[PDB]
């Protein structure tokens, strides 16, 4: 292992092998600032940027002053491994620059408890994919049967759509029940009212670094250049809004109403150590999505639901971020093959995440087979979609020896709609 | 009139003033703008001129990079802000007209001038609302019969664009490549699309936000409205059709977008306001308004290849082709609690008329490459050739004035 001058628990989720980037404030200083999260502290880099004298950051400090990472994140690969460099030399347990300079290191350092966490960028537009294979298999057959499941294209390409970026929240925000249209009985006029189909659907998410020039599409073998870090996510749907607006342009207000990420960006660095060889896909993709580059994670994913009467959490979903079947390569390759123009801060989903067991399907829409099976909430009590006042977190960890790289929480609640 | 000599065709009398983003060889630096004549009024310049209860004490909204912050203001600001321009270019208010000095600093000429996206565009939004439009799709995609589908009388069906790509007029566009599926029976392609289409829109920024879980309800959504621009949403159909079931479309648009820089204001737009286009079945009263908020805007789409001496126009049609109004679409966007902010994006649906002659597509206007279109020197086209430049512009008519919207144009570069 490796260890800090901060004392960090084996299961934390913060070791000196993780070290995420995030937008924090506090009661003693409300502007928004980029910190780095180590044991239960927060390092302020706003603080300690003059430590960074190499020759990626060296001219480019105020990096480490601006109220969101997008700076950060467009610099590239270079700079992000010199600041973790930097980083990991600064934290060690055996480097006394910050150790042991008492002044520095007492306005460096804040408690997580203190801070408030906000959104690590500005996302100029977010994307969701559909890249799990068990997950859009399960939605054919709810839909359209067993034997209609996948669509033609869907072992193709990585299907995706357009997300609305504005309602994408950070971990915490309260999240209120939708009003809209549905058509719960197709002999009658469609209905307006609150949704009754609430649910919530286990992602992960990654960041973009340097962006692509508008009309210049990012080649595969340069995808891994543009991809910064990740979060947890949890794309809030509703299912009834959703069913009867979707064809034929796809979900829009069935989304948008809320979408929660995890605050801390967990950078790729930190992730390597946990790849593992791709998928096989067959049939094989066209030339310009096929890479032999390992870039498949092992991350041990969880989703709790504690009612508001509950003092217990229950686990509904165990599901692992190995089981995707096209890439983040393949979907940031995609996004850009026909010269879209990817920015820094932009957010690419992954999609649902569902393995084969029913123990891993990452929807409530699944996990309660389209509202036909009770989800175990916690004895004498059941789901099938969520209720007001249900709070959903999410968590996500790799599990290394004697040390965990970790997510910290994508949590929020369910408030009761406005009628 | 204005002080400032103004042609009787001009897009730009006392009458329009639309807000733009603009920087010369002399100032890099993206700024503020009104079109007037063939001149543009620097904002930045002026700002101290602004003098009311509503902006003075938030004049720095006119010294910034991009629309937003005005945007954001509302309505008052915004009526204070033509009042006060109208009343400074009819020198009711002298100060600009009698200070040489100032005034040599304030104007500059449109043709020296670069224009600049008006706003950064947080969300764009595309909807679907021309009904001959949606409708000759379905003809089209799925037959008469079931031209329609069963939303589309309900709600104002739209999808999430992508905003990176929304360009200034004048934008080159490249051809994009994609994946396409020419051949039902074997695998799909990797190459140049082959329908690379046009799409004339039009659509409107957004003001002040609504609050996160927060809906706009329909009475107010007249407030958000800022003003329009027109568009042209690029489309590649070959890998449209491909892609789009079941997400919707995605790489098929989002290789490019093009807007006109000028932004008509609302109040600009009003003299030209119709009845609304009656909705059966009636809508949910969510989207019930008796306010009119439908707009007689004359559009043209000319065409021009290489080779070819002269534009041909391909296209003539109206804004008031369209069955849901612009509060309709802004209401329902936030009836889940959706967070409209200011610089938003909500563009019309391709616009047709019920004449041929009107429809807003090529892929309209060829009927999916069936029917040869005329443009002109010999020439005819199924969908855009590399080398093609296409151009949007709009006016309103008035007596004895038009409000025009300047051009909506680009020109498509081979493929990479
Ligand atoms: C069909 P769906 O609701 O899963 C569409 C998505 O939102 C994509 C996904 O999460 O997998
Ligand atoms: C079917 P389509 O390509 O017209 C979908 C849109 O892009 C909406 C529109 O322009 O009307
Ligand atoms: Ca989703
Ligand atoms: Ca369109
Ligand atoms: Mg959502
Ligand atoms: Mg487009
Ligand atoms: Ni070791």
Redesign the interface.
């Given at each position: 292992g490796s260890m800090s001058f901060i004392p960090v628990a084996e299961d934390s989720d913060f070791p000196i092998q993780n070290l995420p980037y995030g937008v924090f404030s506090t009661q003693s200083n409300p502007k928004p600032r980029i910190g780095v999260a180590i044991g239960d502290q927060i390092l302020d880099l706003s603080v300690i940027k003059h430590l960074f004298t190499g020759p990626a950051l060296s001219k480019h400090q105020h990096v480490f002053d601006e109220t969101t990472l997008n700076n950060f994140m467009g610099l590239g690969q270079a700079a992000w491994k010199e600041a973790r460099a930097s980083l990991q030399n600064l934290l060690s347990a055996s480097q006394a620059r910050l150790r042991d300079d008492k002044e520095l290191r007492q306005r460096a350092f804040t408690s997580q408890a203190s801070a408030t966490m906000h959104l690590p960028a500005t996302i100029?537009?977010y994307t969701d994919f559909?890249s799990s294979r068990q997950h859009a298999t399960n939605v054919g057959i709810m839909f359209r049967g067993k034997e209609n499941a996948l669509?033609?294209?869907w072992l193709?390409?990585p299907?995706?759509?357009?997300?609305?970026?504005?309602?994408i929240?950070v971990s915490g925000?309260?999240?209120?029940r939708?009003?809209?249209?549905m058509?719960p009985d197709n002999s009658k006029?469609?209905?307006?009212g609150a949704c009754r189909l609430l649910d919530m659907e286990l992602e992960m998410a990654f960041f973009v670094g340097p962006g692509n020039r508008?009309?210049?599409?990012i080649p595969i073998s340069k995808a891994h250049e543009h991809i910064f870090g990740m979060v947890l996510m949890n794309d809030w749907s509703?299912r009834d809004?959703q069913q009867?607006?979707?064809?034929?342009?796809?979900?829009?207000?069935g989304k948008?109403?809320?979408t929660t990420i995890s605050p801390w960006v967990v950078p790729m660095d930190a992730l390597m150590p946990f790849v593992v060889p791709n998928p096989k896909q067959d049939?094989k993709p066209?030339?310009?999505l096929c890479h032999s580059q390992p870039y498949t994670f092992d991350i041990n994913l969880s989703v709790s639901l504690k009612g508001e009467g509950m003092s217990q959490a229950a686990t509904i979903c165990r599901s692992n971020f190995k089981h995707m079947y096209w890439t983040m390569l393949q979907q940031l390759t995609?996004?850009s093959?026909?010269?879209?123009?990817?920015?820094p801060g932009?957010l690419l989903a992954s999609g649902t995440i569902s393995g084969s067991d029913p123990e891993s399907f990452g929807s409530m829409l699944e996990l309660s087979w389209k509202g036909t099976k009770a989800i175990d909430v916690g004895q004498g009590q059941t789901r099938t979609f969520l209720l007001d006042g249900d709070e959903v977190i999410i968590t996500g960890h790799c599990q290394g020896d004697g040390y965990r790289v970790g997510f910290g929480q994508c949590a929020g609640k369910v408030?009761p709609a406005?009628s």
């Open positions: 100029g537009d559909y669509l033609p294209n193709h390409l299907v995706g759509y357009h997300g609305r970026a504005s309602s929240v925000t309260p999240i209120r939708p009003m809209g249209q058509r006029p469609p209905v307006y508008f009309g210049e599409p509703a809004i009867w607006e979707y064809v034929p342009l796809g979900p829009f207000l948008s109403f809320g049939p066209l030339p310009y995609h996004h093959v026909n010269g879209c123009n990817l920015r932009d408030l406005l």
